[model samples]
Target: LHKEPATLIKAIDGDTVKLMYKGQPMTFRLLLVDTPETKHPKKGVEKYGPEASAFTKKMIENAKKIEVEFDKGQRTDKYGRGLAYIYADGKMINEALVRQGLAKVAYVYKPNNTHEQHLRKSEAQAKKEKLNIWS
Candidate 1:
């Protein structure tokens, strides 16, 4: 699907993003991870919420093309939007978010994981160092 016209509009919290693809608006929930809720109604807002959103925005904002790779186990969430591991310039955007302390590893749906081990290590290192938003 590299030929698809994909443009990231903004980061919705840390784990979700809004994008325009082929003239259709789409939301993507990053696979294999979940970040703290920045917009939770009941919660007062988690630590590092804004920082995580900013970090995610910085990574994708103004980028021309986004490459989305789908896992074989799960293609889309119940919401009908694509679940993806995004990449740009050989950088794993999902792992980068975790490594930057902008997101957390979400291994809830274990069967769908393709990069769980690496994500776990990256998250551990981020927690140890307290990088970016984590601190």
Candidate 2:
């Protein structure tokens, strides 16, 4: 079963979060997306990075409940963390970030993925529009 209009409980940095789905606790990783490293001290912040995080916070604030979809092949990323596609109000939140140019499509194990295409387009559009953290 899935929860609709899921409520965001906490924002864990820029890329991860905790949500309440049907009164149950759920943790989600924004799929097919990676923001500038905000939590790492070793990695220097990227351009418009804080703004990107703020953008994500704004989106999460607008949703009452978050919906989750699952993928096959792997459930955890070797750290026993549950991986999922997070959505709100029929929108793929992770993809939306990429689409908005606030995030970049990142693939750790694969190259030229389908998600990468969308992200590339998003980045291009962002570049064209000079949207957040870009301009």
Candidate 3:
């Protein structure tokens, strides 16, 4: 996989982000992980939503560098937003969220699940510890 360098424009929510990729701003929905909805049109702030959003914001906001990695299959969501794995300071933010229990491993699909194993392990550990979402 190749990682494209990007500038953090905004941590839109827990699982989505706005960034300056290439020469224009783009929205990316993190693949393989689902954070609670903080801004869904109908979800209206699910439990622990704010915490997940805040956690993502803090991670990316403080990172020295941010990058996005695309999977081998579909590259966008139904809304045409880019689907990627966001990295902050060389750490996989998607996995971090699951490990912290701020998000869950989900929306998995073939060829685009390169990091599924890592995420599942993280989620399992979080579950064993009963962290946040699991709690």
Candidate 4:
């Protein structure tokens, strides 16, 4: 697991966030999870998208501190965004998003799936509960 310290600047959506890293601003798109789209200029807001965004925003706001952890493989996307697993106060933000049913497994690649099994289990739990998006 490649990890780095960071301080949150803002939450862009359910799956993306901005933070201060090495005195510079960086955006780290959460790895291993995907939430719906709250803002789609043409597609309009998707079901459960607003809730997902709000859930993410609240999680970030309540965090005592933030850090980003990248997968053990390819670390950045084409847009130069860092792919990472965010943590706040030792809690895995990506896992929490899926555990609570606000997100599902998204954009997975073989090399960047360190926590795949756990995330899949989380999704299963969320689906079984029929919570949020599953409802």
Model 4: number of clashes?
Answer: 0
> Candidate 4: lDDT of 80?
83
Question: Per-residue lDDT tens digits of candidate 2, residues 19-91?
Answer: 7765877666766778875766677666656766777777777875567665544545655445666776677
Which stretches of model 4 miss by more than 4 angstroms? Answer: none
TM-score, model 2 to reference: 0.74
Task: Specify the highest-lDDT model's number.
Answer: 3
How do the residues 1-135 of candidate 1 rate in per-residue lDDT, one tens digit apiece?
232346787678777888776577888888887777678778747777777777677778745567677776777799877787877555677899899887878865756777888899999999999886567
Native-referenced Cα lDDT, model 1: 0.76
Reference-based TM-score, model 3? 0.97
Q: Give the Cα error of residue 36 in candidate 1, in Å.
A: 1.7
- RMSD score of candidate 3 (Å): 0.9
Find the candidate with the highest TM-score and give its number. 3
Residue 26 error for model 1, in Å?
Answer: 1.4
Q: Which stretches of candidate 1 lie over 4 Å from their true place?
A: 1-5, 132-135
Q: Using lDDT as the measure, what is the rank order of every candidate, best first? A: 3, 4, 1, 2
Q: Candidate 2: deviation at residue 88, Å?
A: 1.8
Flag the better candidate by TM-score, 1 or 2.
Answer: 1
Instruction: Give the TM-scores of the predictions, in the order they appear.
Output: 0.82, 0.74, 0.97, 0.93
Model 2, position 113, has a per-residue lDDT of 40
Q: Which ten residues in a row have the lowest lDDT in candidate 1?
A: 1-10
